[PDB]
């Protein structure tokens, strides 16, 4: 007679049924999955089938109204750690799964929860009324675990591994409010979810592992622990990612950006190399040719060097041109080392070596102003320091290096240079908008400045930051594979990031933007004491990502 | 009154068991035994032979009572019977 305070790893507890669990469902499922041949990996005494293994944990507080959604999960073999490994050698799967819930409360609390299975074809989100489905009610004072089973309600005969199809969804909601009769600061409890395959889960058709690999099915391995710790760079400045920058207003980034369709709207490959263009007018203001600023420009839509697009040459920064003249260093400009070369043979001009500032302008021989849309604009170079002589050749070419630094007037630092007001964008790209409490984020990096090249992180003169939209391994991996059959429009792919003290969640949309649920805060996330990164899977987009650092 | 069943009805019943037991299947119900109005269209003297006058897809919205009952069910299967009534006159042909 064991007590209920100790639970065994094979123990389901109380089995809570629902009207969707029927015998004819199981018989039809087995008899129609039989077209894939005999079932595989169905030995009932194996250790990977008999035990429950960890899936998730969530929080239930007293401020949650009835009908609030606390936890959702889509039907997949990626919810178990061992059926995700075994799916690399098979081409189909069919069957159900069991989910075990443990509520960590006491006998003094009040309140109840509700769980139901949602058939495919129904949108999951706020306004989904769970209590008018066939449901099970679970008390907050329960000591033994409660397990319900999600069956396979599908319109196919089996699920192909790349393209499963329509699946059911398990949703847990709030029946009645949580009550603490004492009242005070202690108002929250925690529930843990675990998973185990059911008795009719199987695979069917064996295949070579050197077929469609694990990097073409789900983008779970695109974001790992060393990517955000010490290996990955950003897609704008090619610098070490140190933090996360919330943007509560919104932004749109076009160049060197990839969606979940294997497509780009920009004009750059996913690599950092030289910027080369020819056939552009070069000039210099004034008459004296010693210590004279150098000017160069060319129109947009003419650079025939890229197989991708001809808006700008490969590697051009997507920043609007800040206008300047005279002996004044501009504020927050993309500057980089380079020189102007001779278009007839390729011989560079040796005396015209300086740091040139790049951007997008509207009138280059006339008055100078920044511009954002690429239609009717042009690409403009102008050196920030004094250079010797100037070539007035009409087809003259420009050669700049890959990486750049910030142009600052003084030795002190400023805010993140790439603010969302001035980002040059091709017309036709979508923007990133806040969805509820979730707001778009960028990836911060320590980038040197032209007023103090010795300055690093933690310096006494301030730290200079430059931001990008995606990490570089992510956009490299997004241009090699296709993930159309991994995320519906209106969903996020969620990763859990743990720290030494707290943990937070980030999500990736179909458009290729990253999100975090922080509201209207503008504080940088430190991202120094990060420990582990774990994938979670598809979740509804109108659900708050958990953000607590403590 | 005789009720007509489909030619593929035995395979249609068995393969829909992945959704569970069948619901609203009672052959003496009054919403199921009578014909009810669906739509109307026009046949003109200027229509060439071979022209299409009417096109409808298989759906539970081509009936006033299966459209009401589809607000509380996530799934359907089975056939549907159609009937055509010409207003007409005895002096016409075609």
């Amino acid at each position: 007679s064991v007590p209920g305070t100790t639970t065994d790893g094979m123990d389901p507890g109380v089995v809570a049924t629902t009207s969707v669990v029927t015998a004819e469902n199981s018989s039809a499922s087995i008899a129609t999955a039989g077209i894939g041949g005999p079932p595989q990996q169905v030995d009932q005494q194996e250790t990977w089938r008999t035990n429950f293994y960890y899936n998730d944990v969530f929080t239930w507080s007293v401020a949650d109204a009835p009908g609030s959604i606390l936890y959702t999960v889509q039907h997949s073999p990626q919810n178990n750690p061992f059926t995700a490994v075994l799916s690399q050698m098979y081409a189909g799967w069919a069957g159900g799964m069991q989910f075990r819930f443990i509520v960590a409360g006491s006998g003094v609390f009040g309140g109840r929860l509700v769980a139901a299975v949602i058939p495919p074809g129904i949108e999951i989100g706020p306004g989904l009324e769970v209590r008018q489905f066939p449901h099970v009610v679970i008390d907050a004072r329960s000591l033994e675990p409660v397990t319900i089973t999600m069956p396979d309600l599908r319109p196919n005969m089996y699920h192909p591994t790349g393209d499963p199809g329509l699946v059911p969804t398990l949703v847990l909601s709030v029946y009645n409010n949580l009550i603490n009769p004492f009242g005070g600061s202690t108002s929250a409890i925690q529930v843990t979810v675990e998973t185990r395959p059911s008795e009719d889960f199987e695979f069917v058709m064996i295949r070579a592992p050197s077929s469609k690999t694990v990097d073409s099915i789900s983008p779970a391995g695109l974001l790992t622990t060393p990517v955000l710790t010490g290996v990955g760079n950003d897609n704008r400045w090619n610098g070490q990612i140190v933090g996360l920058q919330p943007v509560p207003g919104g932004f749109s980034t076009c160049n060197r950006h990839w969606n979940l369709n294997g497509s780009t709207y920009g004009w750059s490959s996913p690599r950092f190399a030289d910027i080369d263009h020819r056939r552009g007018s070069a000039s210099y203001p004034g008459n004296n040719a010693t210590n004279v600023l150098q000017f160069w420009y060319a129109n947009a839509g003419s650079a025939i060097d890229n197989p991708i697009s001809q808006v700008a040459p490969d590697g051009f920064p997507d920043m609007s041109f800040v206008p300047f003249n005279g002996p004044g260093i501009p504020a927050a400009g993309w500057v980089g080392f380079g020189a102007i070369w001779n278009s007839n043979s390729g011989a560079p001009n040796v005396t015209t070596v300086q740091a040139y500032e790049l951007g997008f302008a509207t009138g280059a021989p006339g008055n100078l102003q920044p511009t954002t849309n690429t239609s009717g604009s042009q690409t403009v170079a102008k050196s920030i320091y004094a250079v010797v002589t100037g070539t007035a050749q009409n087809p003259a070419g420009l050669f700049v290096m890959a990486s750049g630094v910030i142009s600052t007037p003084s030795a002190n630092a400023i805010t993140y240079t790439p603010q969302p007001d001035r980002i040059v964008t091709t017309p036709g790209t979508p923007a990133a908008a806040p969805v509820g409490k979730n707001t778009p984020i960028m990836f911060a990096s320590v980038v040197r400045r032209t007023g103090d090249v010795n300055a690093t992180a933690g310096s006494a003169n301030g730290t200079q930051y430059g931001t990008g939209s995606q990490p570089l391994p992510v956009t490299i991996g997004l241009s090699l594979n296709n993930y159309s059959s991994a995320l519906m429009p209106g969903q996020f792919f969620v990763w859990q990031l743990t720290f030494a003290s707290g943990f937070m969640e980030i999500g990736l949309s179909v458009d290729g933007y990253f999100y975090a649920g922080t509201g209207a805060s503008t504080t940088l996330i430190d991202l120094t004491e990060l420990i582990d990164v774990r994938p979670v899977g598809p979740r509804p987009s109108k659900s708050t990502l958990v953000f607590n650092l403590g | 009154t005789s009720v007509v069943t489909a030619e593929n009805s035995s395979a249609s019943i068995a393969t829909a068991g992945i959704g569970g037991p069948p619901q609203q299947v009672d052959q003496q119900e009054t919403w199921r035994t009578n014909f009810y109005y669906n739509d109307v269209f026009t046949w003109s003297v200027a229509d060439a032979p071979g022209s299409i006058l009417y096109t409808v897809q298989h759906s539970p919205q081509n009936n006033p009572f299966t459209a009401v009952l589809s607000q509380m069910y996530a799934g359907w299967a089975g056939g549907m019977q159609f009937r055509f009534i010409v207003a007409g006159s005895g002096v016409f042909g075609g």
Binding site: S27, A28, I30, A31, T32, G34 | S10, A11, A14, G17
Partner: peptide, 10 residues
């Protein structure tokens, strides 16, 4: 599995 084919046969 057997009940499915049995029902379709019957």
């Amino acid at each position: 599995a057997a009940e499915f084919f049995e029902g379709m046969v019957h």
